[PDB]
Each structure stands twice: as structure tokens, then as C-alpha cells.
Write an enzyme that holds these catalytic residues in place. Structure first.
Site, PDB file in Angstrom:
ATOM      1  N   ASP A 122       0.901  -1.133   0.000  1.00 34.82           N
ATOM      2  CA  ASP A 122       0.000   0.000   0.000  1.00 34.82           C
ATOM      3  C   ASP A 122       0.955   1.201   0.000  1.00 34.82           C
ATOM      4  OD1 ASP A 122      -2.223  -1.567  -0.010  1.00 34.82           O
ATOM      5  OD2 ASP A 122      -2.567  -1.486   2.158  1.00 34.82           O
ATOM      6  N   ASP A 124       0.736   3.859   1.765  1.00 34.51           N
ATOM      7  CA  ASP A 124       0.884   4.477   3.078  1.00 34.51           C
ATOM      8  C   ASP A 124       1.559   3.676   4.195  1.00 34.51           C
ATOM      9  OD1 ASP A 124      -1.042   2.689   3.517  1.00 34.51           O
ATOM     10  OD2 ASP A 124      -2.720   4.151   3.527  1.00 34.51           O
ATOM     11  N   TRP A 184     -13.645  -1.421  -0.193  1.00 39.07           N
ATOM     12  CA  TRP A 184     -12.774  -1.821   0.883  1.00 39.07           C
ATOM     13  C   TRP A 184     -13.068  -3.167   1.513  1.00 39.07           C
ATOM     14  CZ3 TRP A 184     -12.826  -2.933   6.163  1.00 39.07           C
ATOM     15  CH2 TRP A 184     -11.560  -2.927   6.771  1.00 39.07           C
ATOM     16  N   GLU A 187     -10.305  -8.547   0.173  1.00 43.62           N
ATOM     17  CA  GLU A 187      -9.428  -9.081  -0.848  1.00 43.62           C
ATOM     18  C   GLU A 187      -8.133  -9.635  -0.271  1.00 43.62           C
ATOM     19  OE1 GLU A 187      -7.140  -5.748   0.163  1.00 43.62           O
ATOM     20  OE2 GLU A 187      -9.309  -5.827  -0.105  1.00 43.62           O
ATOM     21  N   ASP A 188      -7.560  -8.967   0.723  1.00 42.57           N
ATOM     22  CA  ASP A 188      -6.322  -9.485   1.283  1.00 42.57           C
ATOM     23  C   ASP A 188      -6.638 -10.780   2.015  1.00 42.57           C
ATOM     24  OD1 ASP A 188      -7.802  -7.765   2.852  1.00 42.57           O
ATOM     25  OD2 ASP A 188      -6.224  -7.492   4.336  1.00 42.57           O
ATOM     26  N   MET A 214       2.046   3.829   9.521  1.00 39.27           N
ATOM     27  CA  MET A 214       1.076   4.057   8.471  1.00 39.27           C
ATOM     28  C   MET A 214       0.628   5.502   8.534  1.00 39.27           C
ATOM     29  SD  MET A 214      -2.862   2.905   8.118  1.00 39.27           S
ATOM     30  CE  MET A 214      -3.025   1.230   7.484  1.00 39.27           C
ATOM     31  N   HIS A 217      -5.114   8.903   7.303  1.00 39.41           N
ATOM     32  CA  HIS A 217      -5.717   9.795   6.321  1.00 39.41           C
ATOM     33  C   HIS A 217      -7.230   9.715   6.414  1.00 39.41           C
ATOM     34  CE1 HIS A 217      -6.005   5.747   5.034  1.00 39.41           C
ATOM     35  NE2 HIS A 217      -4.708   5.679   4.785  1.00 39.41           N
ATOM     36  N   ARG A 219     -11.020   9.056   5.608  1.00 35.26           N
ATOM     37  CA  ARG A 219     -11.658   7.975   4.857  1.00 35.26           C
ATOM     38  C   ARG A 219     -11.850   8.322   3.382  1.00 35.26           C
ATOM     39  NH1 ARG A 219     -16.182   8.280   5.424  1.00 35.26           N
ATOM     40  NH2 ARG A 219     -16.364   8.335   7.715  1.00 35.26           N
TER      41      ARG A 219
HETATM   42  C1  LIG Z   1     -14.770  -9.607   7.143  1.00 36.55           C
HETATM   43  C2  LIG Z   1     -13.734  -9.778   6.046  1.00 36.55           C
HETATM   44  C3  LIG Z   1     -13.753  -8.548   5.138  1.00 36.55           C
HETATM   45  C4  LIG Z   1     -12.922  -7.469   5.805  1.00 36.55           C
HETATM   46  O1  LIG Z   1     -13.442  -6.433   6.200  1.00 36.55           O
HETATM   47  N1  LIG Z   1     -11.601  -7.752   5.910  1.00 36.55           N
HETATM   48  C5  LIG Z   1     -10.684  -6.768   6.526  1.00 36.55           C
HETATM   49  C6  LIG Z   1      -9.382  -6.671   5.716  1.00 36.55           C
HETATM   50  O2  LIG Z   1      -9.672  -6.319   4.336  1.00 36.55           O
HETATM   51  C7  LIG Z   1      -8.471  -5.641   6.325  1.00 36.55           C
HETATM   52  O3  LIG Z   1      -7.217  -5.617   5.659  1.00 36.55           O
HETATM   53  C8  LIG Z   1      -8.188  -5.984   7.807  1.00 36.55           C
HETATM   54  C9  LIG Z   1      -7.432  -4.888   8.550  1.00 36.55           C
HETATM   55  O4  LIG Z   1      -8.189  -3.669   8.535  1.00 36.55           O
HETATM   56  O5  LIG Z   1      -9.439  -6.164   8.501  1.00 36.55           O
HETATM   57  C10 LIG Z   1     -10.318  -7.142   7.965  1.00 36.55           C
HETATM   58  O6  LIG Z   1     -11.483  -7.209   8.745  1.00 36.55           O
END
Ligand SMILES: CCCC(=O)N[C@@H]1[C@@H](O)[C@H](O)[C@@H](CO)O[C@H]1O
Ligand SMILES: [Ca+2]
EC number: 2.4.1.-
Lengths: 272, 123
Positions: A122, A124, A184, A187-188, A214, A217, A219
Site C-alpha cells: 500500500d 501508506d 474496501w 481481498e487481502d 502508516m 488519512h 476515509r
Molecule cells: C470480514 C472480512 C472482510 C474485511 O473487512 N476484511 C478486513 C481486511 O480487508 C483488512 O485488511 C483488515 C485490517 O483492517 O481487517 C479485515 O477485517
């Protein structure tokens, strides 16, 4: 002329990281005379087996990028990596799509060099200890392990967002990252389920060596929390097969080579 | 305010075991529901979710934007945005008792395993 050693003799350990002072890329450019057009550098002292393409998903955050480049460049050169910086700018007004842009980065970077390792970062997140090498290992590597946003702690064991490194083999093994996560979240986590479904385990530096800051910033009204993420992260096993490297389509609107970085604006479409 | 796992854990002790959900599961759910942010506000699909528990104004609390839902919780939605968690907890229980844990979509995917990590050893 001889392979670079296992551990760089240039490392300092912990660094002070602050976003109080303003950055001047021209200064940054000056301070890092070894960086060539496009944000490329190749240790001339030894040969690094680490040919690393660094990919930064991006959209209207030029200020972050400044700091990123200001701190990252001296560190990456000290870690003795043969790297390249790539900012994947998302054109348009559709929700942010991080994973997809990371997919674009992979493809585009390859067109430039024989890269064998990809770090996805990312814009940031800044590493506070140059011992947290930005490269690849025998297993997928999670790097933003102790972010200050989380009290210099790993918020959850299945966490893979922030900054990570996958070798080409590793990335190729999971059909890359998904393309259908708009907005948001998740995906990760989806990427985590992939590495898991492919018999790989996540590797990480300890909580001390992995400290990271980090830049907070306001939203992003163009990256609202994705309402579908909860259902999508539950089907990776099925979907990583149809949505990934193999289903990647996008249109390159412009390729910009700055002295410190390559910026690629793309049109990755709309939430289909 | 962004709370820590332990702060949240100690605040909700009275929801422990309620409806079958343990403290460890709630700590996990909450992390993935609001990131421990007592002020989280997410609005989509014409309704707004508030606070630590992301309680929606569609049925549970009264908001000036959507002035007359059933307000099952009997509370103003802005009440779920401070650092006083009692009403939030009181509301969540109504949700658990009426709709159940599935109200919290973070639960099934992120909190079905590896729960031990969610424990807070701090007294
Ligand atoms: C419930 C699953 C979907 C979701 O919101 N996943 C998020 C991630 O994308 C994010 O990187 C991390 C840290 O903020 O927190 C999780 O909760
Ligand atoms: Ca309250």
C-alpha cells in the site's frame, strides 16, 4: 561480481519515521543518485539473486507516495535488492480495487524485466527496521506484521494485507489475486485463503523487526466498505479458479517513467 | 475511539456465553465488524450501521435520517457512537436474542477457527 551476501552489511536496524516534514522529490532524487529512470536500481557491488518488482496500488494520494519514495528508496538499496518501483494508478470513479491493480502491476512489471519476486505495498505503509527485507522467501511473505495502527502487533493471524511478497512461482500458483473485489475489505483475506488452499504457509519477521508506520488519512469516499466482501471471502476455493491472472483484462491509458518511479494509469473497468 | 482487544473484552464480559457466543468469538467478530472503533459509521443500501457492533438503523435504533424504524433497541442511534458501551451491549443482546449471531457476517468466515489468539490474558 560475486553474489550479494545473505545479510546486507549496510543495514542500520530501527529508523525514526515521521510525516511531519515536507518532501521534495527533487531532493529525494538528489539523495538517491543511483536510482535510474523508472525507479530502478541494481547493486553494482555484488549480484543480488533478488530481482524484485515493487507494486503500489494507487489513486489520488500523491503525498503518501512522496514519503513512500523518500524512505523506501534508501532502504531497498541498503537491502541490496535489484528492484523496480511501480505505481498502478486507477483511472475513473469506480470503487478502489487493490487486488486487481496488484494484478496489473505483476503483468506490467514483467514487460520490463525478468523479475522473480513481487512485493505488493500500500502507498501508506513505511517499514521501521531495514532488517525486514522487502523480498521473497521459500513461502509467501507477510511484511506489515507490526503496524502502529494495530499497536505494533499482528491484528489477526490470518492477516495478509498491507505489504507482502510472493515469488513468481507462488503468485502463479494461486492464479494471482482476485479481480472482483470492488471497495474496501476482504481481498487481502481472499488472497490468504488462496495461499492456504495451495498448501503454502505465511512467513513473517518477528514483531520487533516488522514494526511499521502508516500515514493515517481521512476515509476515502471512493473506497467505501465493500458490502459483498463477507460472502466473497467464503468461496475463494471455487473462485480463485475463475477470477485471477487468467481472467485479467484492463486497458493501459498511459505509462509514465519518472526518475524515481514508473506510473501506469489503467482502466480496469467497472464492478461487473 | 479505537479500543484494544483487551479493552473491548473487559467491557463486554456480560455478553460472554450469551446465546452461545463466547468472549473470544466476540473479540474476533468485533475486530472484523468495526476494528474496535466505537465511532464507526458505515452507510449503504439506504441504512446506516453504527459503532463497535455496527448496529443498523433499519430496525434497531432511531436515526434522524430514517426517523421511524421499529427502534427495537429503544435508543437513539447516536448513542451507539460514544465510549459508553452498556447500551450498545444491551442492544446487541436484543439482536442476538432476536436475529442471532448471523447478524454479524464477520462471524462465520473469520471466527470459525483460531480463536485462542482472541483471548485477553490482561486481568
Ligand atoms: C470480514 C472480512 C472482510 C474485511 O473487512 N476484511 C478486513 C481486511 O480487508 C483488512 O485488511 C483488515 C485490517 O483492517 O481487517 C479485515 O477485517
Ligand atoms: Ca453507547
Amino acid at each position: 561480481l560475486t553474489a550479494c551476501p545473505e545479510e546486507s552489511p549496510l543495514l542500520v536496524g530501527p529508523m525514526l519515521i515521521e510525516f511531519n516534514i515536507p518532501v521534495d522529490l527533487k531532493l529525494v532524487e538528489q539523495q538517491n543518485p543511483k536510482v535510474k529512470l523508472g525507479g530502478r536500481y541494481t547493486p553494482m557491488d555484488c549480484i543480488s539473486p533478488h530481482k524484485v518488482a515493487i507494486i503500489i496500488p494507487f489513486r489520488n494520494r500523491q503525498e503518501h507516495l512522496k514519503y513512500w519514495l523518500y524512505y523506501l528508496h534508501p532502504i531497498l538499496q541498503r537491502q541490496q535488492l535489484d528492484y523496480g518501483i511501480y505505481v498502478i494508478n486507477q483511472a475513473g470513479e469506480s470503487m478502489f480495487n487493490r487486488a486487481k491493480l496488484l494484478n496489473v502491476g505483476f503483468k506490467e512489471a514483467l514487460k520490463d524485466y525478468d523479475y522473480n519476486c513481487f512485493v505488493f505495498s500500500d502507498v501508506d505503509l513505511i517499514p521501521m527496521n531495514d532488517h525486514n527485507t522487502y523480498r521473497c522467501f521459500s513461502q509467501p511473505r507477510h511484511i506489515s506484521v507490526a503496524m502502529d495502527k494495530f499497536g505494533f502487533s499482528l491484528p489477526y493471524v490470518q492477516y495478509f494485507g498491507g505489504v507482502s511478497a510472493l515469488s513468481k512461482q507462488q503468485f502463479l500458483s494461486i492464479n494471482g489475486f482476485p479481480n472482483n473485489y470492488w471497495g474496501w475489505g476482504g481481498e487481502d483475506d481472499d488472497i490468504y485463503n488462496r495461499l492456504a488452499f495451495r498448501g503454502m504457509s505465511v512467513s513473517r519477521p518477528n514483531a520487533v523487526i516488522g514494526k511499521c508506520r502508516m500515514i493515517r488519512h481521512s476515509r476515502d469516499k471512493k473506497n467505501e466498505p465493500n458490502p459483498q466482501r463477507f460472502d466473497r471471502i467464503a468461496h475463494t476455493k471455487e473462485t480463485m479458479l475463475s477470477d485471477g491472472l487468467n481472467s485479467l483484462t484492463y486497458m493501459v491509458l498511459e505509462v509514465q517513467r519518472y526518475p524515481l518511479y514508473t506510473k501506469i494509469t489503467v482502466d480496469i473497468g467497472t464492478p461487473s | 475511539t479505537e479500543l484494544t482487544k483487551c479493552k473491548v473484552s473487559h467491557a463486554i464480559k456480560d455478553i460472554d456465553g450469551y446465546q452461545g457466543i463466547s468472549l473470544l468469538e466476540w473479540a474476533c467478530v468485533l475486530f472484523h465488524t468495526s476494528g474496535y472503533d466505537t465511532q464507526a459509521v458505515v452507510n449503504d443500501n439506504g441504512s446506516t450501521e453504527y459503532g463497535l457492533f455496527q448496529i443498523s438503523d433499519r430496525f434497531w435504533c432511531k436515526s434522524s435520517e430514517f426517523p421511524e424504524s421499529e427502534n427495537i433497541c429503544g435508543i437513539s442511534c447516536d448513542k451507539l457512537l460514544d465510549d459508553e458501551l452498556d447500551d450498545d451491549i444491551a442492544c446487541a443482546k436484543k439482536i442476538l436474542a432476536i436475529k442471532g449471531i448471523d447478524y454479524w457476517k464477520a462471524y462465520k468466515p473469520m471466527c470459525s477457527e483460531k480463536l485462542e489468539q482472541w483471548r485477553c490474558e490482561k486481568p
